[PDB]
Amino acid sequence: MVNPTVFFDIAVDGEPLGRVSFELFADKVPKTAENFRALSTGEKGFGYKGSCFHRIIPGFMCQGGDFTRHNGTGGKSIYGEKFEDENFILKHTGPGILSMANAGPNTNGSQFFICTAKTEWLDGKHVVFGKVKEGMNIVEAMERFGSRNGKTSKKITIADCGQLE
Numbered sequence: 001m002v003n004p005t006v007f008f009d010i011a012v013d014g015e016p017l018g019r020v021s022f023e024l025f026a027d028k029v030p031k032t033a034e035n036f037r038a039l040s041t042g043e044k045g046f047g048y049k050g051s052c053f054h055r056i057i058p059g060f061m062c063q064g065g066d067f068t069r070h071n072g073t074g075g076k077s078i079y080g081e082k083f084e085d086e087n088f089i090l091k092h093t094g095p096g097i098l099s100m101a102n103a104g105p106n107t108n109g110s111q112f113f114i115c116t117a118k119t120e121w122l123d124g125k126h127v128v129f130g131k132v133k134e135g136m137n138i139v140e141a142m143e144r145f146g147s148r149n150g151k152t153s154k155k156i157t158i159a160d161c162g163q164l165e
């Protein structure tokens, strides 16, 4: 019944930066939380380890999770290539919100974003499923490698990831 916690160890051109951990709201969005959790442990045989943050826009969000094409055009969920929008109970209330990227209704895969500002205009369009627990400072450090158009100035990778006890 306690919401799960997952971590990401972040590197910058291969050099360790720090760890960000996330509370996944499995009490409110279990299907979506489970997908992110499993992708984070790699227990299905695929997932986030080694993948990059391909789009980082300071004052907006950091986006990653495209472990098949590395640029925002790929990824897949543990349920198939895509899955439905589970619900929109949770809103984009400020920095640290963890939400699913998508390409239209009912097109969730593996891509996600971490907000670094309130993004209210995404409410009811993107499924919010977690929040940063520890290491928002590390998110803020990653954010400084982004740009207005989202292209990063150094390669930002998930060097390791998994589930915390």
Ligand SMILES: C#CCN(Cc1ccc(N)cc1)C(=O)NCC(=O)OCC
Binding pocket: 061, 063, 071, 072, 073, 074, 075, 100, 101, 102, 103, 107, 108, 109, 110, 111, 113
């Ligand atoms: C290019 C590209 C990637 N992409 C389209 C996309 C997203 C998720 C999945 N599974 C497939 C395509 C998107 O990034 N779409 C907009 C979005 O979700 O922004 C969140 C702030």
